[PDB]
Amino acid sequence: MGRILVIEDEISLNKTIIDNLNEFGYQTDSSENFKDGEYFIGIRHYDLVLASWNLPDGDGAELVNTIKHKSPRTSVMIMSAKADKDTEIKALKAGADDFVKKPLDFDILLARIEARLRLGGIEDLVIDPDEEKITYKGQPFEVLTHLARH
Amino acid sequence: MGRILVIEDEISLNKTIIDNLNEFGYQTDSSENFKDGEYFIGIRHYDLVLASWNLPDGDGAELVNTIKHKSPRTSVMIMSAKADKDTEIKALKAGADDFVKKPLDFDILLARIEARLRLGGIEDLVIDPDEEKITYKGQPFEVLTHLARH
């Protein structure tokens, strides 16, 4: 049960996506605009965050470069009410953590986002999830983690 | 310039994908069968490895469970000469590192696999790429790496 944030201009449509999101218990904030979502990013902590395109605050590629204020202010995931082929390709170039599309079958996205095996990555542990500073001061991998815990 | 291994039953058809692979200098071995590719996995070292389905040695879901001999013998990437909707969904459930599909536009896959921003992850460095044991015995992130190198 992760958390997936919302970046959308339509509260009805963002609730429709929030269906798929909280289908895995994803914490959400109903966005009435792209800016609404980009601030919902900062208001709370989340495991994955949508982004938009061609919204009232979505300036397309200009929004693409804008939303990554210096180092990207999260917004790892993306959303789209269409296939957004060019947008989808560009986001994949950006290596987004996830993404959602309306024409895509929602059962398929349910199975995917619900479980897609998307794995990758104490005395000295200085992990800071709030500031994205996962770190152990000092740092068979499971054995290594067990030794670190003890 | 990485390496992408091949798992396919047709040498010409797999050479078609090998085009996209060596388009980024991906080392390849022409596979005339699923077993051909699964052994090409072991013959050399690679950055990414296709897998198959419904091949002469592709037993579908049975091949899916078979190819992961105990801990998966690489084969992170997958390939398909069709949309393989069920197969694609299942592989995504497996959290594959990569994949290729024939109906998918090859320019799109060129742009993706060429550059999709897929990054993620000395005195004591005990990294073993040959045996997948990336580790530093002792172990700002760039600063940390610089300090470790010195």
Author numbering:
A (entry chain B), B (entry chain A): 0 to 120, 126 to 143, 151 to 161
Please quote the authors directly.
Interestingly, we indeed observed single-particle images of free CosR (apo-CosR), CosR-DNA, and free DNA. We finally refined cryo-EM structures of this apo-CosR dimer to a resolution of 3.77 Å. The final model of each subunit contains residues 1–120, 126–143, and 151–161. The cryo-EM structure of apo-CosR indicates that CosR can be divided into two domains, an N-terminal receiver domain (RD) and a C-terminal DNA-binding domain (DBD), similar to those found in the X-ray structures of the Thermotoga maritima DrrB, T. maritima DrrD, and Mycobacterium tuberculosis MtrA regulators. Residues 1–116 create the RD, whereas residues 124–221 form the DBD. All of the N-terminal RD residues are clearly visible in the apo-CosR structure; however, many of the C-terminal DBD residues, such as residues 162–221, are imperceptible with no observable cryo-EM densities. Residues 117–123 likely form a flexible linker region to directly connect the RD and DBD.
Importantly, it also modulates the expression of the CmeABC multidrug efflux system, the most predominant and clinically important system in C. jejuni that mediates resistance to multiple antimicrobials. CosR belongs to an OmpR/PhoB family of response regulators. We determined that CosR assembles as a homodimer with each CosR protomer contributing to major conformational changes to facilitate DNA binding.
